[PDB]
Every structure is written in C-alpha cells, then in structure tokens.
Amino acid sequence: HVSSVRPNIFVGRVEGSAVYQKWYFEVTMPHLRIGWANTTGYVPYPGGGEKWGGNGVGDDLYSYGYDGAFLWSGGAKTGVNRTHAEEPYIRKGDVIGCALDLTVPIINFMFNGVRVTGSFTNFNLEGMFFPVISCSSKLSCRFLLGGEHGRLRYAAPPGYSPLVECLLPQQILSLEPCFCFGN
Ligand code: NA
Structure with missing residues (x-):
C-alpha cells in the first residue's frame, strides 16, 4: 500500500559553485514521508540496469525523510518537535517544506512554515538528489x-x-567539476 513518487528532477553538487546549489519545494495533501533521495541508493539489477x-x-x-514527527535515514528514526x-502527524491542509543546500551540505524541513528543529548534515554528495514522497494508498499528495x-x-x-x-539554462563550463556522475 506504500508507493514512492518523484518528478524527473535531479540536482547535484558543483565544486565551489555559488549558483543553483540550494533547492526548495513543498508537499501538500497511513504512511507519509517526504524528503530527498540520492541516486547512490540505486543498485545493480540482475538482468542489467539498476533499481532503487x-x-x-x-x-x-x-535518502533523508520527514513524517511530521521524525527524521528518517537508513531506516532509523529521530524524534523532533511536532505540530x-x-x-x-501530517493532516489535510498542512504544508511540508523541504530544503537542500549542497554547499554545506544540509537538508532542512518545515511544517506549516515553521522550521523543524532537526536536520541532516555531513551526508554523501556523490551522485544526484531527487525530491520524493512515500505515501500509502488513500492518500493523494502533490509536489509544489x-x-x-x-x-x-x-x-x-x-x-x-x-x-x-531546473528548467533555466546554465553554461556547461559553470557546471563542473561536479559529483553528479560518480568521480
Ligand atoms: Na549535474
């Protein structure tokens, strides 16, 4: 009953870049977690290719998630203050903010425009990050x-x-060296 969705959006670290290294989105409306996943979490599939x-x-x-009451990564949960x-923990009308600053790096969250006391830091920067919702059936959530x-x-x-x-053009020379593709 638990599915995950992402838009086809991937962001990654450019060494020493001061532009488009910090990204924000929101989610609005049983399991519900919101956050970022890194493509290093993809692994080889027997026939060929990779799966999550x-x-x-x-x-x-x-990956690095938030469910309104806990931060999640590696299957471990960390309690934070809750609304x-x-x-x-997340109800219809509530709006979850999610932020990724690749220069630190640090991932923050917000609940109804209030900063969550808890963050992810010092995490792997190889590969690329995509926004993700993991939801159970009978829930309909939207990326903003x-x-x-x-x-x-x-x-x-x-x-x-x-x-x-992400739809804006950037010069290729300003997008390197990057870590999006695995050193
Ligand atoms: Na890239």
Whole structure:
C-alpha cells in the first residue's frame, strides 16, 4: 500500500559553485514521508540496469525523510518537535517544506512554515538528489515545485531556488567539476 513518487528532477553538487546549489519545494495533501533521495541508493539489477535499493524515503542509507514527527535515514528514526500530538502527524491542509543546500551540505524541513528543529548534515554528495514522497494508498499528495508547477505557499529560504528553476539554462563550463556522475 506504500508507493514512492518523484518528478524527473535531479540536482547535484558543483565544486565551489555559488549558483543553483540550494533547492526548495513543498508537499501538500497511513504512511507519509517526504524528503530527498540520492541516486547512490540505486543498485545493480540482475538482468542489467539498476533499481532503487529502498522501499521509501529514509529507508536506505542515501535518502533523508520527514513524517511530521521524525527524521528518517537508513531506516532509523529521530524524534523532533511536532505540530500534532498524535498520529496522523501530517493532516489535510498542512504544508511540508523541504530544503537542500549542497554547499554545506544540509537538508532542512518545515511544517506549516515553521522550521523543524532537526536536520541532516555531513551526508554523501556523490551522485544526484531527487525530491520524493512515500505515501500509502488513500492518500493523494502533490509536489509544489514553484511557477505553474504548484505554487509555493511559503517563500523559499534566502539563497534557495524553487525546483522549477531546473528548467533555466546554465553554461556547461559553470557546471563542473561536479559529483553528479560518480568521480
Ligand atoms: Na549535474
């Protein structure tokens, strides 16, 4: 009953770049986790090609999730302060903010425009990061990427870009050296 979705959006670290290294998106509306997954979590598949090594965001070593009450990575959960005392920790109308600063690196979360006290730091930067929701049946959640792809309810943090700006052109020489493809 638990599925994961991502848009076809991948961001990655450019050594020493001061532009488009910080990304923000929101999610709005049983299991529900939101965050970022890194493509290092993909593993070889017998026939050939690769499959995702985990079930949902936060269950493998290379994804980083938040369910309203806990931070998740590598299948471990870390309690944070919460807006609802009991499950469901994320309710209809609530809006989850999710932020990735590749220069630190650090991943932060927000609940209804309030910063979550808890973050992911010092994580692997090889490969690329994509936004992800892991949801059970009977839940319908939407990525808010900015622009006409889902209006953000909150201002992106200072220095951060909505993911819809992945559609803007950048010069190739300014996008290297990068770590998106595995050293
Ligand atoms: Na890249």
